[PDB]
Design a binder for these strands. Structure first.
Lengths: 165, 224, 131, 199
RNA sequence: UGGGCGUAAAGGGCUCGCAGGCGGUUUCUUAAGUCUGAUGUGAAAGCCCCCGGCUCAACCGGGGAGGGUCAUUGGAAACUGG
């Protein structure tokens, strides 16, 4: 990456929470499951899937799991540098660059992680399954996929920022 | 730095079990067993030498994993010589990952060790102290290596990554660089600094860990 | 059944990126060597060298690789295909992947990059996109 | 339509003194209604959207269709959306009036415009929503210069906006230049108000 | 543009084959498709752009833009076609 340091506190806004039940002989045990994601609004974003019987335990497990990973999330001109398609779990999602005045345009929790990106504007659209979990894993796998054009320009000896835009 | 003569008996090891990805390290087939290319070993051991030399200045701790028979015997003496912490037998799950629970474990070891002499004896009924003593005997072997460590290692050594591929997966789950010898049946990608050489021979682990412990003892010799 | 040598060369270079071999061979054509020269200009690939043998062939292509791992190209696709003709007016040509990507557009003046095509103001068939 | 309710209660619904700024709120910290003593619950995202739009709305008192009109016409404009939108709201005559200090609140200023107290380029304009061209003058008109309420407004002092200018001795002021977004400091986000109308 | 077909709906029981669709490489030529300039028209109103006028607005008007596997004609030869 290299590595994954976690040295900055966040509000850690929640994206999802839902109760879950499992059959057992003599009854139905209950355990809660909550997804929460972290983002410094400085271009770093991470995700945390935390399930527990107790809600503070679930959200805090989601906090530590969010702490476990972060994404570089490139941002040229206060927006994502390039358009991307990202399927996952039969859950595709499309993202595109937008005008600075366009604002953030997406679904709920994906708008949440995008607000955690700190980006002022974005185009986005869900595809396939509507379930929030795969939408987050796909949107963030796509954020991991993202790289600055200037970075790829650094990767090879041609010229800095070829095409204008 | 390792000399060619030291590599003179260590040539060759696994066959049939070989991973294709490591084919570049392979020189040519003979009889059945493949022969490792010695020059590539000189290069990788060279980079490993400069790297291990770089770690000594940092003061960073290093792990010496060892589980396999007729190989674990060497890492013990090499670690006692280096003074560095080590693993005698099978690696326990989460010893690198759980961190704090294992710290509770070494804390318990330190507690019972105090129980040996402070006067806990001749107070508790004999059956209980007899039970806890055997439990401590269960502790000393697995924890003899844990006694020298507490912080997470800057790097870790391994005598056979395929045996330790899950522990290697844990170190990759972290950010720790991994030095270690690698066989043809093992995958190079898991190890950023591979050492293509045989490990099943006692001498195989012995000479490599000897050159490594010598590089460490030499690099640390300056102190000041 | 060898329906199109150029798309075949594209699955060759994509599979080559997938397998990370240093080099691979392709059958000769000037149409192929020209766009390969265009990739040589773009620098995504390190080198290309033909080796004559009767009659056609055989070019050997050397994939470039990054200093810090990572595939040099994150994507490659041939929008043009038999059984579906495509055309592009000079102002209508997309700038794929924004400023990083480049079009490979054959024109009356020959194969051209989207920047050079925009400068020449020359339209033509869009052979493929690489990014 | 516009005004008919308490309006102060509406500001209580906001939880913020805007507008403002003269609302106290502190006198009754609790939210309006029985549920106000209890701790606030987080709003639904779309509910936060409508709450934000309405929060931007109460300071103006502007009608839904008209506010939407200024919105999409602002979006038709090239450049920053929130800047053109906020400056479009700031282009309204009654806002220039209240910011000029003619009134304690924008609604009575709209009533004073409705009376036609306020000349534009020396010409009377009874419509509050009238567009403010740059360099246009704004005055109390010579016939209306003597009134206790207007003088009561003039006697109070307040800091002038950089984009406007004014002189009490001439009882007259004007729109010197188009406002920067940096000059104004609304409590409301503009990315959020452009967010509400996604379609 | 912008979905599939092992097990959720969905590969024809298999094959021979007309029409149809697609089709290796080198070279020359043709200019049908294509790319490009010019010209003719594609009414006005209306939509869009910059402005003016009913006190703003609606509404109204000025110029410009927009819109054709469009037509006519001069060129471009890489691709596809002959």
């Amino acid at each position: 990456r290299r590595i994954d340091p976690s040295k900055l506190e966040l509000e850690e806004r929640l994206v999802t929470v839902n109760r879950v039940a499992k059959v057992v002989k003599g009854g139905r045990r209950f355990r809660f499951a909550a997804l929460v994601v972290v983002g410094d609004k400085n271009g770093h974003v991470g995700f945390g899937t935390g399930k527990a019987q107790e809600v503070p335990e679930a959200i805090r497990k989601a906090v530590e799991d969010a702490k476990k990973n972060l994404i570089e999330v490139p941002m040229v001109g206060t927006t994502i540098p390039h358009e991307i398609i990202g399927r996952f779990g039969a859950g595709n999602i499309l993202l595109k660059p937008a005008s600075e005045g366009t604002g953030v345009i997406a679904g709920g929790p994906v708008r949440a992680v995008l607000e955690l990106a700190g980006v002022a504007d974005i185009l986005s659209k869900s595809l396939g399954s509507n379930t929030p979990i795969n939408m987050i894993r796909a949107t963030l796998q796509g954020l991991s996929e993202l790289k600055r054009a200037e970075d790829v320009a650094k990767l090879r000896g041609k010229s800095v920022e070829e095409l204008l835009g | 730095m390792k000399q060619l003569l030291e590599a003179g008996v260590h040539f060759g090891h696994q066959t049939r079990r070989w991973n294709p990805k490591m084919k570049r390290y392979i020189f040519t087939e003979r009889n059945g067993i493949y022969i490792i290319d010695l020059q590539k070993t000189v290069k990788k051991v060279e980079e490993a030498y400069n790297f291990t030399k770089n770690l000594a200045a940092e003061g960073g701790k290093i792990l010496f994993v060892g589980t396999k028979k007729q190989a674990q015997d060497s890492v013990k003496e090499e670690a006692q010589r280096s003074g560095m912490y080590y693993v005698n037998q099978r690696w326990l799950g989460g010893t690198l990952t759980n961190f704090e629970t294992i710290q509770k474990r070494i804390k318990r070891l330190k507690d019972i060790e105090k129980m040996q002499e402070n006067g806990t004896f001749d107070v508790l009924p004999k059956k209980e102290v007899v039970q806890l003593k055997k439990e401590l005997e269960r502790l000393e072997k697995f924890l003899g290596g844990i006694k020298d460590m507490k912080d997470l290692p800057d790097a870790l050594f391994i005598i056979d990554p395929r045996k330790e591929r899950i522990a290697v997966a844990e170190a990759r789950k972290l950010n720790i660089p991994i030095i270690g010898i690698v066989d043809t049946n093992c995958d190079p990608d898991e190890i950023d600094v591979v050492i293509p050489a045989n490990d099943d021979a006692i001498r195989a682990v012995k000479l490599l860990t000897s050159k490594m412990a010598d590089a460490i003892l030499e690099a640390k010799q300056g102190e000041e | 059944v060898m329906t199109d040598p150029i798309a075949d060369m594209l699955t060759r270079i994509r599979n080559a990126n997938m397998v990370r071999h240093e080099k691979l061979e392709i059958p000769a054509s000037k149409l192929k060597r020209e766009i390969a020269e265009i990739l040589k200009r773009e620098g995504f690939i390190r080198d290309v060298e033909f080796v004559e043998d009767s009659k056609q062939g055989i070019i050997r292509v050397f994939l470039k690789y990054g200093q810090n791992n990572e595939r040099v190209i994150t994507g490659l696709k041939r929008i043009s295909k038999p059984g579906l003709r495509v055309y592009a007016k000079s102002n209508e040509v997309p700038r794929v992947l924004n400023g990083l990507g480049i079009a490979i557009i054959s024109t009356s003046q020959g194969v051209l990059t989207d920047k050079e095509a925009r400068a020449k103001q020359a339209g033509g068939e869009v052979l493929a996109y690489v990014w | 339509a516009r005004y008919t309710g308490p309006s102060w209660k509406l500001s209580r619904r906001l939880g913020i003194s805007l507008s403002g700024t003269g609302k106290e709120l502190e006198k009754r910290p609790y939210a309006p209604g029985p549920h106000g003593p209890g701790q606030r619950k987080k709003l639904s995202e779309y509910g936060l959207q409508l709450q934000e739009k309405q929060k931007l709305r109460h300071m103006y008192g502007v009608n839904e269709r008209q506010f939407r009109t200024l919105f999409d016409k602002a979006g038709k404009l090239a450049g920053k959306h929130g800047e053109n939108f906020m400056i479009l709201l700031d282009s309204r005559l009654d806002n220039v009036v209240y910011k000029l200090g003619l009134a304690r609140t924008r609604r009575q200023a709209r009533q004073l415009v409705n009376h036609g107290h306020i000349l534009v380029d020396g010409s009377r304009v009874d419509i509050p929503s009238y567009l403010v061209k740059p360099g246009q003058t704004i005055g109390v008109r010579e016939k209306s210069r003597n009134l206790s309420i207007i003088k009561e407004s003039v006697e109070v002092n307040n800091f002038v906006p950089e984009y406007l200018t004014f002189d009490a001795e001439k009882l007259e002021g004007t729109f010197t230049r188009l406002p920067e977004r940096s000059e104004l400091a609304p409590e409301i986000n503009e990315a959020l108000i452009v967010e509400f109308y996604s379609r």
